PDB file of C-alpha atoms in Angstrom:
ATOM      1  CA  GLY A  17     -69.872  97.502 -50.579  1.00 23.28           C
ATOM      2  CA  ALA A  18     -73.048  95.408 -50.531  1.00 24.80           C
ATOM      3  CA  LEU A  19     -73.491  91.853 -49.261  1.00 21.80           C
ATOM      4  CA  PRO A  20     -75.411  89.394 -51.437  1.00 21.14           C
ATOM      5  CA  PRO A  21     -79.002  88.460 -50.629  1.00 19.60           C
ATOM      6  CA  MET A  22     -79.451  85.905 -47.877  1.00 22.91           C
ATOM      7  CA  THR A  23     -82.021  83.241 -48.636  1.00 25.38           C
ATOM      8  CA  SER A  24     -83.314  80.698 -46.145  1.00 24.45           C
ATOM      9  CA  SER A  25     -84.294  77.178 -47.144  1.00 22.16           C
ATOM     10  CA  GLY A  26     -85.163  76.210 -43.579  1.00 23.14           C
ATOM     11  CA  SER A  27     -81.897  74.297 -43.405  1.00 23.46           C
ATOM     12  CA  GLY A  28     -80.771  73.338 -39.924  1.00 24.85           C
ATOM     13  CA  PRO A  29     -77.549  74.179 -38.116  1.00 26.90           C
ATOM     14  CA  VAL A  30     -75.210  71.472 -39.552  1.00 27.86           C
ATOM     15  CA  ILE A  31     -73.956  71.669 -43.144  1.00 28.32           C
ATOM     16  CA  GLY A  32     -75.262  68.518 -44.675  1.00 28.12           C
ATOM     17  CA  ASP A  33     -77.257  66.423 -42.275  1.00 28.47           C
ATOM     18  CA  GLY A  34     -76.594  65.450 -38.695  1.00 30.44           C
ATOM     19  CA  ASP A  35     -78.164  63.350 -35.991  1.00 30.11           C
ATOM     20  CA  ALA A  36     -80.830  65.210 -34.007  1.00 30.83           C
ATOM     21  CA  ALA A  37     -78.680  65.170 -30.853  1.00 31.62           C
ATOM     22  CA  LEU A  38     -75.780  66.730 -32.760  1.00 29.54           C
ATOM     23  CA  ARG A  39     -77.931  69.402 -34.398  1.00 33.05           C
ATOM     24  CA  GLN A  40     -79.324  70.271 -30.981  1.00 33.14           C
ATOM     25  CA  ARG A  41     -75.975  70.703 -29.238  1.00 32.96           C
ATOM     26  CA  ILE A  42     -74.475  72.486 -32.242  1.00 30.46           C
ATOM     27  CA  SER A  43     -77.359  74.963 -32.255  1.00 31.18           C
ATOM     28  CA  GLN A  44     -76.577  75.789 -28.626  1.00 32.53           C
ATOM     29  CA  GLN A  45     -73.067  76.915 -29.626  1.00 32.48           C
ATOM     30  CA  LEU A  46     -74.170  79.241 -32.442  1.00 33.41           C
ATOM     31  CA  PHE A  47     -74.421  82.915 -31.515  1.00 32.80           C
ATOM     32  CA  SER A  48     -77.586  84.864 -32.221  1.00 31.32           C
ATOM     33  CA  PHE A  49     -77.705  88.658 -32.162  1.00 32.43           C
ATOM     34  CA  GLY A  50     -81.403  88.625 -31.190  1.00 30.83           C
ATOM     35  CA  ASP A  51     -81.692  91.684 -33.438  1.00 31.58           C
ATOM     36  CA  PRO A  52     -84.639  92.082 -35.856  1.00 32.29           C
ATOM     37  CA  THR A  53     -82.302  93.927 -38.263  1.00 31.44           C
ATOM     38  CA  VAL A  54     -79.665  91.145 -38.406  1.00 31.81           C
ATOM     39  CA  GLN A  55     -80.898  88.261 -40.547  1.00 31.65           C
ATOM     40  CA  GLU A  56     -79.470  84.837 -39.574  1.00 30.40           C
ATOM     41  CA  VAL A  57     -79.348  81.579 -41.557  1.00 29.90           C
ATOM     42  CA  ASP A  58     -77.806  78.239 -40.615  1.00 28.66           C
ATOM     43  CA  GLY A  59     -76.028  75.249 -42.082  1.00 29.12           C
ATOM     44  CA  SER A  60     -76.042  74.969 -45.856  1.00 30.06           C
ATOM     45  CA  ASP A  61     -77.904  78.293 -46.141  1.00 31.20           C
ATOM     46  CA  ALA A  62     -74.996  79.796 -44.192  1.00 27.62           C
ATOM     47  CA  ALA A  63     -72.393  78.058 -46.374  1.00 26.88           C
ATOM     48  CA  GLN A  64     -74.117  79.368 -49.521  1.00 26.95           C
ATOM     49  CA  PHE A  65     -74.049  82.915 -48.165  1.00 28.79           C
ATOM     50  CA  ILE A  66     -70.378  82.543 -47.223  1.00 26.04           C
ATOM     51  CA  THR A  67     -69.529  81.336 -50.716  1.00 29.52           C
ATOM     52  CA  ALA A  68     -71.535  84.111 -52.347  1.00 28.38           C
ATOM     53  CA  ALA A  69     -70.061  86.799 -50.075  1.00 31.26           C
ATOM     54  CA  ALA A  70     -66.507  85.566 -50.727  1.00 29.08           C
ATOM     55  CA  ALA A  71     -67.116  86.200 -54.445  1.00 28.79           C
ATOM     56  CA  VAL A  72     -68.714  89.660 -54.461  1.00 29.78           C
ATOM     57  CA  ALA A  73     -67.267  92.257 -56.827  1.00 29.27           C
ATOM     58  CA  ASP A  74     -66.192  94.428 -53.873  1.00 31.40           C
ATOM     59  CA  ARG A  75     -62.835  93.030 -52.751  1.00 28.68           C
ATOM     60  CA  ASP A  76     -62.898  94.505 -49.234  1.00 28.50           C
ATOM     61  CA  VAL A  77     -66.212  92.743 -48.573  1.00 26.27           C
ATOM     62  CA  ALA A  78     -65.063  89.516 -50.228  1.00 25.39           C
ATOM     63  CA  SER A  79     -61.900  89.512 -48.139  1.00 20.57           C
ATOM     64  CA  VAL A  80     -64.029  89.347 -44.982  1.00 19.93           C
ATOM     65  CA  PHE A  81     -65.447  85.986 -46.010  1.00 20.17           C
ATOM     66  CA  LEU A  82     -62.496  84.417 -47.875  1.00 16.26           C
ATOM     67  CA  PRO A  83     -61.055  82.643 -44.785  1.00 16.09           C
ATOM     68  CA  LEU A  84     -64.501  81.226 -43.987  1.00 13.73           C
ATOM     69  CA  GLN A  85     -64.907  79.973 -47.567  1.00 13.57           C
ATOM     70  CA  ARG A  86     -61.449  78.421 -47.530  1.00 11.70           C
ATOM     71  CA  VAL A  87     -62.100  76.312 -44.400  1.00 10.21           C
ATOM     72  CA  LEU A  88     -65.449  74.983 -45.629  1.00 11.19           C
ATOM     73  CA  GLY A  89     -63.216  72.688 -47.668  1.00  9.19           C
ATOM     74  CA  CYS A  90     -61.885  71.300 -44.378  1.00  7.38           C
ATOM     75  CA  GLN A  91     -65.088  69.348 -43.711  1.00  9.58           C
ATOM     76  CA  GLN A  92     -63.912  65.761 -43.374  1.00  8.80           C
ATOM     77  CA  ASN A  93     -67.207  64.229 -44.488  1.00  7.77           C
ATOM     78  CA  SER A  94     -70.138  59.320 -43.674  1.00  4.63           C
ATOM     79  CA  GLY A  95     -69.685  61.960 -40.990  1.00  5.13           C
ATOM     80  CA  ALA A  96     -71.424  65.331 -40.704  1.00  4.03           C
ATOM     81  CA  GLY A  97     -70.326  68.793 -41.765  1.00  4.16           C
ATOM     82  CA  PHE A  98     -69.606  71.898 -39.741  1.00  3.34           C
ATOM     83  CA  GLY A  99     -72.165  73.845 -37.774  1.00  2.13           C
ATOM     84  CA  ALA A 100     -72.683  77.213 -39.440  1.00  2.00           C
ATOM     85  CA  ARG A 101     -74.546  80.493 -39.163  1.00  2.00           C
ATOM     86  CA  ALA A 102     -74.348  83.553 -41.374  1.00  2.00           C
ATOM     87  CA  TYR A 103     -75.492  87.038 -40.436  1.00  2.00           C
ATOM     88  CA  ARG A 104     -76.580  89.909 -42.666  1.00  2.00           C
ATOM     89  CA  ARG A 105     -77.776  93.270 -41.444  1.00  2.00           C
ATOM     90  CA  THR A 106     -80.920  94.347 -43.287  1.00  2.00           C
ATOM     91  CA  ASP A 107     -79.048  97.113 -45.154  1.00  2.00           C
ATOM     92  CA  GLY A 108     -76.548  94.547 -46.464  1.00  2.00           C
ATOM     93  CA  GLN A 109     -73.639  96.682 -45.233  1.00  2.00           C
ATOM     94  CA  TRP A 110     -72.669  94.603 -42.155  1.00  2.00           C
ATOM     95  CA  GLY A 111     -72.480  90.918 -41.362  1.00  2.00           C
ATOM     96  CA  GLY A 112     -70.352  87.854 -40.888  1.00  2.00           C
ATOM     97  CA  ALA A 113     -70.486  84.174 -40.172  1.00  2.00           C
ATOM     98  CA  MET A 114     -69.337  81.588 -37.694  1.00  2.00           C
ATOM     99  CA  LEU A 115     -68.434  77.923 -38.056  1.00  2.00           C
ATOM    100  CA  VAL A 116     -68.672  75.499 -35.119  1.00  2.00           C
ATOM    101  CA  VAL A 117     -67.019  72.070 -35.372  1.00  2.00           C
ATOM    102  CA  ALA A 118     -68.079  69.408 -32.855  1.00  2.00           C
ATOM    103  CA  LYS A 119     -64.928  67.534 -31.861  1.00  2.00           C
ATOM    104  CA  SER A 120     -66.782  64.203 -31.782  1.00  2.00           C
ATOM    105  CA  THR A 121     -67.572  64.535 -35.507  1.00  2.00           C
ATOM    106  CA  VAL A 122     -63.890  64.916 -36.458  1.00  2.00           C
ATOM    107  CA  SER A 123     -62.131  61.686 -37.384  1.00  2.00           C
ATOM    108  CA  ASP A 124     -58.679  63.310 -37.639  1.00  2.00           C
ATOM    109  CA  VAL A 125     -58.423  66.307 -35.342  1.00  2.00           C
ATOM    110  CA  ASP A 126     -54.805  66.962 -36.324  1.00  2.00           C
ATOM    111  CA  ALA A 127     -55.728  67.058 -40.023  1.00  2.00           C
ATOM    112  CA  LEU A 128     -58.613  69.433 -39.311  1.00  2.00           C
ATOM    113  CA  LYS A 129     -56.261  71.763 -37.465  1.00  2.00           C
ATOM    114  CA  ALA A 130     -53.716  71.689 -40.301  1.00  2.00           C
ATOM    115  CA  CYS A 131     -56.420  72.287 -42.919  1.00  2.00           C
ATOM    116  CA  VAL A 132     -57.824  75.188 -40.918  1.00  2.00           C
ATOM    117  CA  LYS A 133     -54.450  76.799 -40.530  1.00  2.00           C
ATOM    118  CA  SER A 134     -53.909  76.572 -44.314  1.00  2.00           C
ATOM    119  CA  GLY A 135     -57.136  78.444 -44.932  1.00  2.00           C
ATOM    120  CA  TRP A 136     -57.806  80.589 -41.886  1.00  2.00           C
ATOM    121  CA  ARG A 137     -56.262  83.928 -40.951  1.00  2.00           C
ATOM    122  CA  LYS A 138     -54.402  85.509 -38.042  1.00  2.00           C
ATOM    123  CA  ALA A 139     -56.802  86.834 -35.400  1.00  2.00           C
ATOM    124  CA  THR A 140     -57.978  90.371 -36.219  1.00  2.00           C
ATOM    125  CA  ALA A 141     -59.940  92.539 -33.812  1.00  2.00           C
ATOM    126  CA  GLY A 142     -60.702  95.018 -36.607  1.00  2.00           C
ATOM    127  CA  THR A 143     -62.578  98.265 -36.118  1.00  2.00           C
ATOM    128  CA  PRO A 144     -66.153  99.535 -36.521  1.00  2.00           C
ATOM    129  CA  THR A 145     -65.460  99.903 -40.258  1.00  2.00           C
ATOM    130  CA  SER A 146     -63.017  97.044 -40.901  1.00  2.00           C
ATOM    131  CA  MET A 147     -63.011  93.277 -40.869  1.00  2.00           C
ATOM    132  CA  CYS A 148     -62.523  91.051 -37.830  1.00  2.00           C
ATOM    133  CA  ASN A 149     -61.874  87.355 -37.329  1.00  2.00           C
ATOM    134  CA  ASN A 150     -60.946  85.010 -34.524  1.00  2.00           C
ATOM    135  CA  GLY A 151     -60.977  81.353 -33.544  1.00  2.00           C
ATOM    136  CA  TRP A 152     -61.526  79.542 -30.228  1.00  2.00           C
ATOM    137  CA  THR A 153     -61.705  76.081 -28.761  1.00  2.00           C
ATOM    138  CA  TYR A 154     -63.452  74.948 -25.574  1.00  2.00           C
ATOM    139  CA  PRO A 155     -63.242  73.315 -23.220  1.00  2.00           C
ATOM    140  CA  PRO A 156     -59.456  73.417 -23.172  1.00  2.00           C
ATOM    141  CA  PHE A 157     -59.257  69.615 -23.108  1.00  2.00           C
ATOM    142  CA  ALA A 158     -62.553  68.130 -24.282  1.00  2.00           C
ATOM    143  CA  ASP A 159     -62.338  64.536 -23.059  1.00  2.00           C
ATOM    144  CA  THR A 160     -64.816  63.340 -25.684  1.00  2.00           C
ATOM    145  CA  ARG A 161     -64.087  59.816 -24.440  1.00  2.00           C
ATOM    146  CA  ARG A 162     -65.814  60.691 -21.144  1.00  2.00           C
ATOM    147  CA  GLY A 163     -68.744  62.136 -23.084  1.00  2.00           C
ATOM    148  CA  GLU A 164     -67.466  65.715 -22.861  1.00  2.00           C
ATOM    149  CA  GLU A 165     -68.015  67.440 -26.212  1.00  2.00           C
ATOM    150  CA  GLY A 166     -65.445  69.907 -27.502  1.00  2.00           C
ATOM    151  CA  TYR A 167     -65.878  72.632 -30.118  1.00  2.00           C
ATOM    152  CA  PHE A 168     -63.777  74.562 -32.595  1.00  2.00           C
ATOM    153  CA  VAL A 169     -65.220  77.990 -33.450  1.00  2.00           C
ATOM    154  CA  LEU A 170     -64.145  80.232 -36.323  1.00  2.00           C
ATOM    155  CA  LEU A 171     -65.846  83.557 -36.883  1.00  2.00           C
ATOM    156  CA  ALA A 172     -65.271  86.551 -39.161  1.00  2.00           C
ATOM    157  CA  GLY A 173     -67.250  89.666 -39.977  1.00  2.00           C
ATOM    158  CA  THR A 174     -67.218  93.087 -41.625  1.00  2.00           C
ATOM    159  CA  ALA A 175     -66.666  95.153 -38.468  1.00  2.00           C
ATOM    160  CA  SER A 176     -65.297  94.726 -34.938  1.00  2.00           C
ATOM    161  CA  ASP A 177     -68.781  94.746 -33.403  1.00  2.00           C
ATOM    162  CA  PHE A 178     -69.589  91.565 -35.299  1.00  2.55           C
ATOM    163  CA  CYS A 179     -66.807  89.577 -33.620  1.00  5.17           C
ATOM    164  CA  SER A 180     -66.855  91.475 -30.304  1.00  4.86           C
ATOM    165  CA  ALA A 181     -70.121  90.013 -29.032  1.00  4.56           C
ATOM    166  CA  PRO A 182     -69.175  86.304 -29.276  1.00  7.64           C
ATOM    167  CA  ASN A 183     -65.493  87.041 -28.602  1.00  8.36           C
ATOM    168  CA  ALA A 184     -66.292  88.496 -25.178  1.00  7.17           C
ATOM    169  CA  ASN A 185     -68.090  85.268 -24.230  1.00  3.55           C
ATOM    170  CA  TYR A 186     -65.245  82.980 -25.342  1.00  2.39           C
ATOM    171  CA  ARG A 187     -62.420  85.145 -24.023  1.00  2.00           C
ATOM    172  CA  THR A 188     -63.546  84.292 -20.499  1.00  2.00           C
ATOM    173  CA  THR A 189     -62.628  80.592 -20.609  1.00  2.00           C
ATOM    174  CA  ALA A 190     -61.812  79.348 -24.135  1.00  2.00           C
ATOM    175  CA  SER A 191     -58.434  79.015 -25.857  1.00  2.00           C
ATOM    176  CA  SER A 192     -57.247  80.628 -29.087  1.00  2.00           C
ATOM    177  CA  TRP A 193     -57.532  78.198 -31.979  1.00  2.00           C
ATOM    178  CA  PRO A 194     -55.767  77.180 -34.021  1.00  2.00           C
ATOM    179  CA  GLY A 195     -52.224  78.151 -33.014  1.00  2.00           C
TER     180      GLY A 195
END
């Protein structure tokens, strides 16, 4: 039931590259556990951990990360990739990942939504020993044309206390996403 090793290359928050302003605002949407026993890596490092975790021999662990892996293919990139962070408890028995898409980077928001719903999964609260996943968007109507950024967030993890922290925050004002 082990997660693969998590290696950092110092990669920043956006898969591929992004403008400094984008990396900055993306990084302010990515959750951190602030926990010295939960290793965190970003961007391509996070994508590489997602892809490795989706392929582990243990199917119950791989299933946690499959929906994340499947929506990495939804990156519409010209253009930048998704924001990403992956999390691995030191014992390798707990973790997850979240993807953050900045609405202003998405050339075809309807296509992104359709791609995500092909690859994502129904929201699952899970339990302390079973996988969770959820998706949010905020603000409800991001008028990017008035300079208001919007974000799509997808997160999934090995246990309910992975998703519960960030879920609590979003549940206050964000909307379920996608339908």
